[PDB]
Amino acid sequence: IRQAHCNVSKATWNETLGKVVKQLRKHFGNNTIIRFANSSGGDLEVTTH
Amino acid sequence: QVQLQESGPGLVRPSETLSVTCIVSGGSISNYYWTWIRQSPGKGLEWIGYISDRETTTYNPSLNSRAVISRDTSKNQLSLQLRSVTTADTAIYFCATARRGQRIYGVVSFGEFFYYYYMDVWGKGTAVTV
Amino acid sequence: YVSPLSVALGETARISCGRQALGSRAVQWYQHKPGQAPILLIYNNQDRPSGIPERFSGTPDINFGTTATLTISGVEVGDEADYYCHMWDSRSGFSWSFGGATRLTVLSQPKAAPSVTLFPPSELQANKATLVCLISDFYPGAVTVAWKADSSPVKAGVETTTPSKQSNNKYAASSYLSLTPEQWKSHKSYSCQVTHEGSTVEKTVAPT
Numbered sequence: 613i614r615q616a617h618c619n620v621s622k623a624t625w626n627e628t629l630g631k632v633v634k635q636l637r638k639h640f641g642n643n644t645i646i647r648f649a650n651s652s653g654g655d656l657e658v659t660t661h
Numbered sequence: 662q663v664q665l666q667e668s669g670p671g672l673v674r675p676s677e678t679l680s681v682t683c684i685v686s687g688g689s690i691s692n693y694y695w696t697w698i699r700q701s702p703g704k705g706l707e708w709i710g711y712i713s714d715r716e717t718t719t720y721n722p723s724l725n726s727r728a729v730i731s732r733d734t735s736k737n738q739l740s741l742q743l744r745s746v747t748t749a750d751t752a753i754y755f756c757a758t759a760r761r762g763q764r765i766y767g768v769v770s771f772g773e774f775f776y777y778y779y780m781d782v783w784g785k786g787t788a789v790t791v
Numbered sequence: 792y793v794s795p796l797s798v799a800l801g802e803t804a805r806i807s808c809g810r811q812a813l814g815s816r817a818v819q820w821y822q823h824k825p826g827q828a829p830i831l832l833i834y835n836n837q838d839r840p841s842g843i844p845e846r847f848s849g850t851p852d853i854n855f856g857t858t859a860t861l862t863i864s865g866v867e868v869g870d871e872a873d874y875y876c877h878m879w880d881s882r883s884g885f886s887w888s889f890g891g892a893t894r895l896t897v898l899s900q901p902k903a904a905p906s907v908t909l910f911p912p913s914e915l916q917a918n919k920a921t922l923v924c925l926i927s928d929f930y931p932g933a934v935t936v937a938w939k940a941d942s943s944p945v946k947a948g949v950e951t952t953t954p955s956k957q958s959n960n961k962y963a964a965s966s967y968l969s970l971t972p973e974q975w976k977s978h979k980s981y982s983c984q985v986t987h988e989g990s991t992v993e994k995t996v997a998p999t
């Protein structure tokens with residue numbers, strides 16, 4: 613009896629996060645610092661994948 | 662490379678503190694695990710408890726209310742006290758060294774693993790009668 | 792308790808382990824002779840400590856579903872001992888009790904005629920007498936002891952031990968006949984009869 617889980621390659625995720633933030637900076641500024649965190653709350657179907 | 666030598670009184674009155682000692686001549690007592698097993702006549706031999714290298718004890722739930730195991734630092738010896746012995750505690754007591762191996766069947770982060778123990782080196786055995 | 796197994800001399804044996812596991816396992820196989828220091832044969836299903844011969848082997852669980860059988864190739868007389876199967880799995884907790892004892896027996900051993908020796912009481916100064924009849928180097932370990940006063944059986948004061956194995960892989964046993972010195976000097980001679988299978992050996996001794 614094990615746990616169901618999902619994998620994703622770490623380096624590809626880091627690269628795609630970088631290319632996402634590079635375009636995010638086009639509407640908020642090159643110098644402003646943004647961060648990524650988990651969901652803030654609500655129903656189960658909202659706070660999870 | 663490890664030689665074990667048991668030493669016990671042999672006879673203890675009922676409702677007393679049975680005390681046995683196991684002398685080690687091979688190596689240090691703070692590197693490997695140690696455990697006590699008893700072969701009782703007419704029955705399969707029973708595992709009663711063990712003591713780790715970090716000085717933490719575990720006991721068989723049947724006898725956990727009555728058993729305690731200690732380790733000496735200056736002397737290369739390990740002692741076992743059994744409180745309130747009865748006619749059923751008569752057996753051949755063997756002290757044995759033990760190795761902690763962990764068996765893993767899945768992902769380390771999730772858990773999905775358990776520790777298993779095996780006693781490679783045993784002692785000759787000391788008989789204890791109540 | 793103990794469960795029996797019978798294997799022929801020289802053939803391969805497969806000892807089955809009870810209370811089989813529910814998940815991934817790292818079993819231990821222990822050989823225990825009665826009263827001696829137990830010695831493990833297997834600590835990890837395939838691995839063995841240095842010094843163990845290649846004759847003993849354990850089944851790895853390469854695919855979930857295999858059972859733990861201790862396979863012995865070329866079984867000899869020295870392999871006759873109890874076998875304990877310590878079982879560790881993921882689904883069960885801490886396994887305290889070892890597996891059910893497995894009394895291995897090696898059949899087709901060469902039978903030995905019983906070597907019998909009768910000793911009269913030494914002890915007479917202490918107002919006691921004990922005739923001692925000793926049997927050594929016989930197989931199988933199933934013998935019957937009978938005492939005879941001249942021709943009449945004694946049937947009283949006899950204390951006999953069950954046959955126990957010795958270093959020769961044969962058996963040894965002892966019998967004690969307790970008597971007063973007057974009764975020892977009364978009857979002419981005393982005969983210890985040891986019956987082994989169909990053979991019978993009689994030893995007679997008399998007061999001087």
Ligand SMILES: *[C@@H]1O[C@H](CO)[C@@H](O[C@@H]2O[C@H](CO)[C@@H](O[C@@H]3O[C@H](CO[C@H]4O[C@H](CO[C@H]5O[C@H](CO)[C@@H](O)[C@H](O)[C@@H]5O[C@H]5O[C@H](CO)[C@@H](O)[C@H](O)[C@@H]5O)[C@@H](O)[C@H](O[C@H]5O[C@H](CO)[C@@H](O)[C@H](O)[C@@H]5O)[C@@H]4O)[C@@H](O)[C@H](O[C@H]4O[C@H](CO)[C@@H](O)[C@H](O)[C@@H]4O[C@H]4O[C@H](CO)[C@@H](O)[C@H](O)[C@@H]4O[C@H]4O[C@H](CO)[C@@H](O)[C@H](O)[C@@H]4O)[C@@H]3O)[C@H](O)[C@H]2NC(C)=O)[C@H](O)[C@H]1NC(C)=O
Nearest residue numbers: 619761762763765766767768769815837851852853854855
């Ligand atoms: C998503 O991401 C997830 C996370 O990123 C990812 O999860 C991964 O899942 C997989 C499976 O789903 C996991 O894979 C498992 O890995 C287990 C651990 O394997 C490692 O460790 C062993 C053992 O190491 C000990 O032994 C060696 C010597 O053999 C020593 O050198 C070691 O130091 C260590 O021993 C010391 O340390 C111990 C602990 O301190 C002490 O106890 C001990 O006393 C010593 O001091 C290694 O052998 C493994 O090496 C093998 O793998 C490497 C690559 O890593 C290869 O180069 C090569 O193939 C090596 O052989 C490895 O390092 C495995 O145990 C497990 O497989 C067993 O379990 C399954 C399930 O029960 C069995 O069905 C299967 O048959 C395996 O059983 C074998 O092994 C046991 C253990 O001994 C035997 O008892 C058994 O009989 C059988 O042995 C047979 O095969 C042997 C060869 O394999 C052979 O030698 C024997 O003789 C015999 O024939 C399983 O594969 C993985 O761990 C997860 N990831 C993480 C990070 O945890 C997931 O996959 C991703 N993808 C998804 C979800 O789609």
Ligand SMILES: *[C@@H]1O[C@H](CO)[C@@H](O[C@@H]2O[C@H](CO)[C@@H](O)[C@H](O)[C@H]2NC(C)=O)[C@H](O)[C@H]1NC(C)=O
Nearest residue numbers: 616617618619620621622623624625626767768
């Ligand atoms: C997810 O699983 C797939 C397949 O189960 C993995 O893709 C395989 O990667 C190996 C590289 O070692 C290739 O040789 C195979 O051809 C690939 N399979 C396919 C169908 O393309 C993939 O690497 C896994 N990803 C993660 C993050 O675990």
Ligand SMILES: *[C@@H]1O[C@H](CO)[C@@H](O)[C@H](O)[C@H]1NC(C)=O
Nearest residue numbers: 634637638640641642643644
């Ligand atoms: C941010 O950097 C880009 C370079 O791709 C540049 O074209 C743009 O002018 C910069 N914006 C600011 C506000 O510096």
